[PDB]
Design a protein around this ligand. Structure first.
Ligand SMILES: Nc1ncnc2c1ncn2[C@@H]1O[C@H](COP(=O)(O)OP(=O)(O)O)[C@@H](O)[C@H]1O
Ligand SMILES: Nc1ncnc2c1ncn2[C@@H]1O[C@H](COP(=O)(O)OP(=O)(O)O)[C@@H](O)[C@H]1O
Ligand SMILES: [Mg+2]
Ligand SMILES: [Mg+2]
Lengths: 469, 367, 367
């Protein structure tokens, strides 16, 4: 689910833009307007004057006809697909396996169209739509699935009664329509998630290490991104930059504590730049904002207005949280009470609206469908969703518990696997400043630099440093 | 620690931890003592067998269901049910969790008090609560509006709920299905020359009530075709090797649940009790009680409802008002899968009746 | 800069900025508390739902209109109306605009003080003013002379105004239409066997009071032809599914408004209260009050007026005088279209009650 004027990932535009007719005939691609995971945002390609002449008429959407190629001096979605496969020749992949890295991507695109209506009240449940019959047939040969077994698997909750006495068996309980829309998109956030893990693990075997002991690495990740309106994608970035801001100020105070008593310039103290009240506000167990969100998915009927009134229910205290209409900047005073909130972070007060906030969070890949994509009818595909060559997990299907599984927890838990790995290592902070808007030489903007000094954590270092040396 | 949901079946006790699959243990509640003199001084025989083992040792015991007409007989047998259920099935100690118990929506007071009190002094659990079996059937199919049915051997109920309020005026309790259907099958199977009178054998009748019955779409016309040689005859095979051939009576036993006239008792069928609870609700809300009709329990598992129930209601309801009747699969476990969603969810994690509050307050803490 | 015209309806509070289309938000003014036991522990319930949401959640609330017989019931409910009105409809802070408020023509002292005083201290508006709802209806028609009617559920008024001065000695306020027509419609629909008693359901009476009812041209002769076996029946369909066929009572209720002796109070009909206000003005001016009879207010939207009113007045007034009655579409929003015209103009930019003068003077700034 792509926001307004935003795109998906770049392989879903470079494959659409750069595909030839000897590549399109084996994958059955069409222009971006057709796919629901592409028509949601922006459908335009990045290009330059020379490649603008080469983009085929059958790869163009109505928006592409109206507004043309996007102008950027370095991104070329038509040409960089050619220069992508030169780099796939260089890294360590063959052309037969490169073709198998295009069949998995094209299977995600034809998953992005299935619709589910309400059954004819035939003992409850949902059914697929009549427009989705040829749409399921053109998807199942890409993901390696059977079209008669997949229709059951996208509509039912398979479980067993086998656990003690009598005759045990497997019964089938259909899911609701809204539960089928959240389950169909949960397969696309699982298949592309293990495909990116297969490309990175393949790259790590192109130049394998001799042994391990100490390590010096470079962590690069997205900055404190904040825009005119802030989404669910920006709530996890600004929460990730707040935790990296917690460990940043923790290393600055420790360097001053190991230098003034080590070069002998006396003893001193300072009021530490605590953000624990901001951290507990965002992630505390039971009372935190992210804790209310993973609980909100469990309720009988999800809502986004019922989620918002609960945030100022439990956070009736805490200074770093206010109502959206209280806003310092005028622009966010057109938001109403159960439609957003303002959270002060290390970069200042950033408002977020709550419209579609719960809807973007609620993933759920049930038993009947997680245990179907693991049993895929193609062989390069079954290796992608493990068991792995080294460190095999071997998760069996015969188990019970837990069903839906936590999903508003996976963005914080996976970040905790890196914050405690960083806590055992040293640190070397390199802050990068953009001097102008267009990326042009000799230009300087004091209307662009000062906002990046105040949103990169640099101010917090200067208001911590009061040493006087 | 994870809460434990143990459902006080009318049947048919169900037990399993809070969520998310199915109950660990199900058995039909019976206790049976050994009724003939022992002739092998081994001996190893227990004073009271619970089920499963009391349904394996049929024919040498006298089966006694502890819950009869919707209430527990006495706590001397009930406490032994409980002890067997927690310990020799689920293995966990009650001292390690808050528990969740179920009741009927309308049941003798103060026998919910006495229950709550005895269970606290016998197993000495950290905290607990008692939820009504009907309300939980909303949760099972994630409904926010609608009329709820807990029909088990032998208590039915009809409760109307509107997002997410329960309407006191319209709650209706029928003491009709399903043990009276069990007795009725035994009463119309003597009519075909097969007699069943002793306590153990009564279970076999109940088992044929499960598998082989079905409900008609048009009664009068199913009765017509029964009188001819047109086969509705299915051949059952019986525990000691005997062959039973049933026709007409196969659809007669469940049909009893429409029209209580067959027993002669003064009450009106599920058809009419569904309607009579709706027309005891406020006028504006009636619009959404139509088409949020949710069926539930195990005694609605006949393979000939709900489209009979639909065709009959649609004739009685106001003209051109759309009525969807939603009967899901899994209905035997509906109540339990309901309870599971609740006790796993906060806010209500801090709302169990806890020990210090119970000790101070006493049994009146129930309301 | 831009002012806000927020009209304190007796209905139907209306809110919209100064100029030039229509009000942004109109809603039934009701606050409703939840009156039954809550069983789905979600649950998010608020202290009170206002309308729109209290009109989408009927049958589980207790509706209380905050204005009754032309005076507000208590400011405890009224302030919650205000907070709702500005915030979840208009979407603007009250600190960013001079506002313009209305009250009823001839309203009890100190209800304008207590209002003026609370609204400044609760919302801290930059400046404010209170204009009576009838006077504004002059502007909506562009009149320079004529009698103005603000008739809402349930206080009507009859004010005569000459170029460009109001007469303090000719104004009539009746607490008689339209909420008493609502209660009367409920009193004559019980008369044909459809029983309505509950607060929520009383809104349904208002919806048929709107749509189906009309005024007769001559009562006695429509009553005669009503007695025929010929049909006056119009068929309504109700929320639960029920069908009502009404004939006579359909023209009875809004005919109701002439001859208040149908209820039984001594006050004379709109026919005579119009006339008695005209013959309370100075002699030379009476000439130009004729043909500047302008009807207004939402409770004049029955299609049987104004030519009933016309035919009645022309019979009672002095002969050979040219008397016409002005009735266009828009009358439900007439008052607001008045306010809308005002607040954009100069010189009246300098006639607002400014904050410093309010602080020095206090609430006693009535005159
Ligand atoms: N397939 C079936 N057809 C008809 N009746 C059944 C079927 N399966 C179970 N039952 C009946 O349902 C009862 C179990 O209902 P249950 O939902 O356990 O009620 P409770 O939960 O109140 O004990 C059993 O007594 C059995 O007779
Ligand atoms: N078409 C109609 N016919 C008859 N009465 C109507 C019609 N539309 C609205 N009304 C009545 O008019 C009232 C609204 O009048 P309104 O002009 O809002 O008065 P106020 O402005 O004083 O609140 C409602 O209570 C409703 O009963
Ligand atoms: Mg039950
Ligand atoms: Mg008025």
């Amino acid at each position: 689910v792509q926001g307004k004027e935003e795109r998906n990932y770049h392989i879903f535009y470079r494959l659409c833009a750069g595909a030839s007719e000897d590549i399109r005939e084996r994958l059955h691609l069409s222009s971006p307007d057709n796919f629901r995971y592409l028509n949601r945002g922006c459908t335009r390609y990045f290009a330059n004057k020379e490649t603008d002449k080469q983009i085929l008429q059958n790869r163009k959407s109505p928006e592409y006809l109206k507004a043309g190629s996007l102008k950027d001096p370095l991104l070329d979605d038509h040409g960089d697909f050619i220069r992508m496969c030169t780099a796939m020749k260089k890294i360590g992949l063959d052309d037969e396996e490169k073709l198998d890295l295009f069949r998995v991507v094209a299977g995600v695109l034809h998953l992005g169209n299935i619709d589910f209506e309400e059954a004819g009240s035939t003992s409850g449940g949902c059914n697929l739509k009549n427009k989705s019959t040829q749409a399921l047939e053109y998807c199942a040969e890409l993901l390696g699935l059977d079209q008669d077994d997949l229709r059951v698997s996208l509509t039912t909750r398979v479980m067993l009664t086998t656990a003690g006495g009598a005759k045990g068996t497997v019964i089938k309980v259909p899911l609701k329509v809204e539960q089928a829309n959240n389950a169909r998109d949960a397969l696309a956030k699982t298949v592309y998630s293990h495909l990116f893990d297969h490309v990175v693990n393949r790259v790590n075997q192109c130049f394998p290490f001799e042994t391990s002991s100490y390590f010096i690495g470079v962590l690069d990740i997205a900055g404190f991104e904040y825009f005119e309106h802030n989404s669910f994608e920006q709530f996890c970035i600004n929460y990730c930059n707040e935790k990296l801001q917690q460990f940043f100020n923790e290393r600055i105070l420790k360097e001053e504590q190991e230098l003034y008593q080590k070069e002998g310039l006396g003893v001193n103290e300072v009021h530490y730049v605590d953000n624990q009240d901001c951290i507990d506000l965002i992630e505390a167990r039971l009372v935190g904002i992210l804790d209310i969100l993973d609980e909100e998915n469990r309720l009988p009927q999800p809502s986004d207005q019922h989620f918002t009134s609960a945030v100022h229910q439990k956070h009736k205290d805490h200074f770093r949280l206010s109502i959206p209409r209280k806003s310092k900047l005028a622009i966010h005073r057109n938001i109403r009470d159960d439609e957003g909130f303002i959270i002060r972070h290390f970069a200042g007060a950033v408002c977020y609206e709550t419209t579609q906030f719960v809807e973007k969070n609620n993933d759920a890949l049930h038993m009947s469908l997680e245990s179907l994509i693991c049993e895929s009818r193609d062989k390069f595909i079954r290796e992608l969703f493990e068991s792995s060559t080294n460190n095999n997990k071997d998760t069996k299907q015969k188990a019970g518990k837990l069903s839906f599984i936590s999903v508003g927890n996976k963005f914080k838990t996976q970040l905790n696997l890196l914050l405690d790995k960083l806590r055992s290592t040293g640190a070397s902070f390199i802050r990068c400043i953009k001097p102008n808007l267009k990326m042009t030489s000799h230009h300087f903007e004091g209307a662009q630099i000062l906002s990046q000094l105040q949103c990169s954590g640099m101010v917090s270092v200067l208001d911590l440093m009061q040493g006087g040396f | 620690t994870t809460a434990l949901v143990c459902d006080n079946g009318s049947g048919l006790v169900k037990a399993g931890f809070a969520g998310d699959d199915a109950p660990r243990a199900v058995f039909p509640s019976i206790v049976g003592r050994p009724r003939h003199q022992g002739v092998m001084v081994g001996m190893g025989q227990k004073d009271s067998y619970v089920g499963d083992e009391a349904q394996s040792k049929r024919g040498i015991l006298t089966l006694k269901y502890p819950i009869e007409h919707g209430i527990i007989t006495n706590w001397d047998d009930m406490e032994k049910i409980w002890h067997h259920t927690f310990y020799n099935e689920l293995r966990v100690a009650p001292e390690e969790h808050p528990t969740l118990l179920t009741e009927a929506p309308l049941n003798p007071k103060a026998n919910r008090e006495k229950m709550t009190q005895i269970m606290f002094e016998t197993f000495n659990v950290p905290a607990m609560y008692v939820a009504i079996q009907a309300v939980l059937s909303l949760y099972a199919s994630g409904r926010t509006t609608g009329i709820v049915l807990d029909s088990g051997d032998g208590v039915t109920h009809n409760v109307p709920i509107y997002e997410g309020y329960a309407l006191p005026h319209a709650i209706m309790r029928l003491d009709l299905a399903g043990r009276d259907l069990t007795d009725y099958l035994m009463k119309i199977l003597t009519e075909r020359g097969y007699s069943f009178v002793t306590t153990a054998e009564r279970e076999i009748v109940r088992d044929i009530k499960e598998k082989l019955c079905y409900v008609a779409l048009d009664f009068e016309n199913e009765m017509a075709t029964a009188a001819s040689s047109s086969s509705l005859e299915k051949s059952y095979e019986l525990p000691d090797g005997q062959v039973i051939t049933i026709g007409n009576e196969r659809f007669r036993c469940p049909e009893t649940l429409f029209q209580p006239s067959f027993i002669g008792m003064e009450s009106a069928g599920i058809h009419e009790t569904t309607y009579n609870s709706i027309m005891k609700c406020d006028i504006d809300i009636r619009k959404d009680l139509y088409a949020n009709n949710v069926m539930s329990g195990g005694t609605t598992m006949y393979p000939g409802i709900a489209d009979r129930m639909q065709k009959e209601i649609t004739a009685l309801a106001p003209s051109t008002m759309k009525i969807k009747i939603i009967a899901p699969p899994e209905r035997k476990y509906s109540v339990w899968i309901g309870g599971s969603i609740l006790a796993s969810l906060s806010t209500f994690q801090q709302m169990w009746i806890t020990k210090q509050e119970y000790d101070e307050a006493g049994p009146s803490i129930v309301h």
